[PDB]
Design a protein around this ligand. Structure first.
Ligand SMILES: O=C([C@@H]1CC(F)(F)CN1C(=O)CCN1C(=O)c2ccccc2C1=O)N1CCCC1
Length: 707
């Protein structure tokens, strides 16, 4: 196979604070052009076959269907007088929402998204029940877009209502307790397309209030910031449903603004812009509403608390030099989330060395009452509200699909018991072993990393290791269950390894801030030192190492291949960011500037320019050295991270590095149709994806298959 001829527009010179930089494939930024679509068809025209010629691709796909064909369950959660839970019988495209009148009664289907699209590309995204639990609202995203459409249903007898709301994106959903309507966000009718294939930027998001039974055209706009195109304010009601807490965001940082409105002070209902009272009118800290008792509101904050803590604010006595610390910041443990339950019970879930821990405190004083026992892993689900008298929480780990626990908090002795549990026949945990080491980075900083391998393997660098990482946006990559990665471990004798490099939140905002802006390069160094570790201690070798990542992840893997291509022999970047110069001009990109910086700033341009994947591709100077096999994966409806990044990055690779004679390794790309950034991808498509990713690896590193 030969790489297709791509037209280079050498006249595309733009001036960044003096420096002149060329973008000969800037024409790839037009999704609807004939040239772009020819480029796309042409690339998939050489990748599809390639991927299909590997026989393992069928062995993998077959083992995937089987092993992934197990009952996936969500936590039961009570709304009103009925119970609810999502459930997938095994290989169903999208999870279904079942309902029951009693934890012991038979349960029926309440919402089956599977009947709205022959191929599972229409998916539920976001949902909100009325306070009474008698009305349901849900948004559905087509083809993977972020764009959503909210419909309404009457819980009793599952009735469809004529209500429909369009042009919704990154919106909240809050029902007033009077059950009259719902708060939501929508954008201004922009010229062009609005289905997820466009790249137009998103600004001027407003807060509107839909009154059930009316046309969207009659909705009440409740808040807008016309002087600030980027601010995005979500709303929600206090537990007593008297206050509306509006959280104003600008960028992806864990900081917001807290404005409130005493519903009981509105001259006569919600008739327009609200009389917002500006409590926290600055972006210096995160304020997360937990619950409130009267005017006393309790919020999870990080204000002078890198690891987060708890505070009480009386709205009558707002002055900061008065807030009362309920639960002080833990010197080393990070406070992930807090939930109020059974009125005065508080459930906090900490992150102790990238491991979740579940405790239970007293809202009144904050004293610790109980510790819920969990193995090493992650708590992935929870269900317990102020009015509930019971909790439900899901536990997952590298080797455990999941365990749902239950707990009746009305009992004197708080003893929790297994509610639901599920094992994946075909796999035997006792055969694998999880270890967590701490390796040092280029600067001394000890970085954590988990490693799953079979028991008994001899460290002689003879195994193919899959190294994963993300690094950024305060996201913490904790222990999860991936059948698709285990198969790799047992059917290709591979070594799984996940690194928690700086930029993430595993260690408060100081871990987040140590891998962003002027220190972004700290994650690439952090993630490189991980390959060097696995390789040094004989887990694997350079030619048999694979590094995956997507979104912020994919940028990481793409930059590490550009900086140290001699370290890995395979790279798989999914829907990643590649153009660090023009990234902020698309869809919601402007919100990422808080982690990367802005090419618009003479000072930010210098950090970016040095690592921007698309602008640092180079032919290795050493004779015996070449680029690792690379597979970029992206879809046409990814409006989160528009395809132009990968599209442009691939044209560049095949040209600069691809066309030389010493480069035997492949530089392929695969553009999926009817799929977006990742969320909501139907099962079928999911399976198909991993089969490629791993087939590619097998053909590239020449890996045999182990029955
Ligand atoms: O998608 C993203 C970044 C980093 C993230 F944290 F993962 C999520 N993200 C965001 O861009 C998230 C965008 N986003 C908001 O800012 C927001 C405000 C209120 C409600 C809903 C939303 C929402 O989806 N990226 C892809 C490339 C790297 C960053």
């Amino acid at each position: 196979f030969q790489y297709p001829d791509v037209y280079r527009d050498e006249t595309a010179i733009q001036d960044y604070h003096g420096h002149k930089v060329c973008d000969p494939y800037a024409w790839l930024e037009d999704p609807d052009s004939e040239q772009t679509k020819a480029f796309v068809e042409a690339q998939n025209k050489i990748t599809v076959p390639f991927l299909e010629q590997c026989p393992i691709r069928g062995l993998y796909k077959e083992r995937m269907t089987e092993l992934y064909d197990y009952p996936k369950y969500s936590c039961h959660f009570k709304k009103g007088k009925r119970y609810f839970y999502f459930y997938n019988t095994g290989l169903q495209n999208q999870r279904v929402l079942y309902v029951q009148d009693s934890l012991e009664g038979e349960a029926r289907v309440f919402l089956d998204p599977n009947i709205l699209s022959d191929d599972g590309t229409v998916a539920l995204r976001g949902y909100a029940f009325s306070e009474d639990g008698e009305y349901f609202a849900y948004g559905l995203s087509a083809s993977g877009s972020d764009w959503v459409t909210i419909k309404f249903m009457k819980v009793d007898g599952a009735k469809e209502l004529p209500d429909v709301l369009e042009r919704v994106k990154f919106s909240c959903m809050a029902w007033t307790h009077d059950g009259k309507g719902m708060f939501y966000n929508a954008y201004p009718q922009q010229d062009g397309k609005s289905d997820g294939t466009e790249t137009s930027t998103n600004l001027h998001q407003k807060l509107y209030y839909h009154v059930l039974g009316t046309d969207q055209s009659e909705d009440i706009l409740c808040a807008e910031f016309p002087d600030e195109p980027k601010w995005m304010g979500g709303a929600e009601l206090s537990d007593d449903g008297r206050y509306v807490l509006l959280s104003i965001r600008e960028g992806c940082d864990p900081v917001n603004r807290l404005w409130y409105c005493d519903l009981q002070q509105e001259s006569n209902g919600i008739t327009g812009i609200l009389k917002w009272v500006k409590l926290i009118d600055n972006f210096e800290g995160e304020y997360d509403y937990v619950t409130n008792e009267g005017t006393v509101f309790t919020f999870k904050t990080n204000r002078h608390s890198p690891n987060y803590r708890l505070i009480n604010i009386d709205f009558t006595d707002p002055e900061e030099s008065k807030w009362k610390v309920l639960v002080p910041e833990h010197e080393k443990d990070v406070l992930e989330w807090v939930a109020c339950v059974r009125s005065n019970f508080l459930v906090l879930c900490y992150l102790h060395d990238v491991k979740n821990t579940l405790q239970l405190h007293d809202l009144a004083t904050g004293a610790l009452l109980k510790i819920f026992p969990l193995e090493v892993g992650s708590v992935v689900g929870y269900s317990g509200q102020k009015k509930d008298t019971e909790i439900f929480y899901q536990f997952t780990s590298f080797l455990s699909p999941g365990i749902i626990y239950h707990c009746d908090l009305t009992k004197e002795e708080l003893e929790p018991r297994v509610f639901r549990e599920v094992t994946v026949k075909g796999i035997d945990a006792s055969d694998y072993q999880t270890v967590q080491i701490f390796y040092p980075s280029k600067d001394g900083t000890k970085i954590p990393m988990f490693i799953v391998h079979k028991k008994g393997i001899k460290l002689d660098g003879s195994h193919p290791a899959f190294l994963y990482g993300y690094g950024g946006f305060n996201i913490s990559i904790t222990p999860n269950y991936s059948v698709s990665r285990l198969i790799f471990v047992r059917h290709m004798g591979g070594v799984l390894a996940v690194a928690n490099i700086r930029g993430g939140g595993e260690y408060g905002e100081t871990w987040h801030k140590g891998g962003i802006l002027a220190n972004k390069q700290n994650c690439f160094d952090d993630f490189q030192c991980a390959a060097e570790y696995l390789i040094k201690e004989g887990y694997t070798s350079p030619k048999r190492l694979t590094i995956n990542g997507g979104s912020n992840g994919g940028l990481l893997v793409a930059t590490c291949a550009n900086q140290r291509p001699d370290l890995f022999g395979c790279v798989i970047a999914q829907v990643g960011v590649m153009d660090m110069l023009k990234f902020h001009k698309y869809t919601i990109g402007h919100a990422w500037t808080t982690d990367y910086g802005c090419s618009d700033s003479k000072q930010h341009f210098e950090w970016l320019i040095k690592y921007s994947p698309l602008h640092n591709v180079k032919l290795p100077e050493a004779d015996d050295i070449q680029y690792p096999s690379m597979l970029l994966l992206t879809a046409d409806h990814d409006d989160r991270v528009v395809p132009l990044h990968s599209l442009k990055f691939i044209a560049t690779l095949q040209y600069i590095v691809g066309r030389s004679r010493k480069q035997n390794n492949p530089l392929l790309i695969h553009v999926d149709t009817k799929a977006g950034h990742g969320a909501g991808k139907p099962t079928a498509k999911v399976i198909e994806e991993v089969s490629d990713m791993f087939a590619f690896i097998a053909r590239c590193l020449n890996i045999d298959w182990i029955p």
